[PDB]
Symmetry: C2
Subunit: 124 residues, 2 copies
Amino acid sequence: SMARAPPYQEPPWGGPATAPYSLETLKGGTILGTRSLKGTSYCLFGRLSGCDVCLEHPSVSRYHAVLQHRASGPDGPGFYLYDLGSTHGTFLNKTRIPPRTYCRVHVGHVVRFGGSTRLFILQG
Amino acid sequence: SMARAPPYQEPPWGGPATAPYSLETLKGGTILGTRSLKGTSYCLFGRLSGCDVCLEHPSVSRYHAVLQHRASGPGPGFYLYDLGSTHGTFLNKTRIPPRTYCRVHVGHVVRFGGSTRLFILQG
């Protein structure tokens, strides 16, 4: 069979995060760990082991969503959520975002994928 | 009926938040809602009805803590200040010292006493 394409193409405006932004995980009222976004151009979330963040919940799509960073100017931050046509949705605070549409993630905003219990907080 | 005034003195460096900052409230992995911090210098938390954020949990003090904004000059400056609460104020995974300003970076989590409610500073 013909080898599948990668699930996502980084847009021309994408680039690595240079400032010390991070993603903090919450699970059911409990603060878990923090993942640095420094040096990250984009973070791919999904149930497949090949994702940058591998979610276990069966409602999460194999390739679910991407958090894309906009290239920093020469010098707030430009992070955008992009749902890959997920089966059970991507949520930015309470809103289910439209598929395949870049949605700005302001600092402190919460992201949830499908029915996963994990919440991800963009932090500065 | 009505209570005494809170034991808080707005510091000289305090001033109103002009940018659209807010507090997102969570409980048990569920997002509850958002509280705008627009047009306020400080947000008072506690069990008394006079607080800006009124918590019902009995472990939350009558006047528990303040989130104080630093006056904008010519990262936002928000600082948490526990009013000597009996059962503590938590920032990140730490119970903060009483009556000490502690920087709350955007997206960081605040909790009061034994309450399961979480507050996230958002931009």
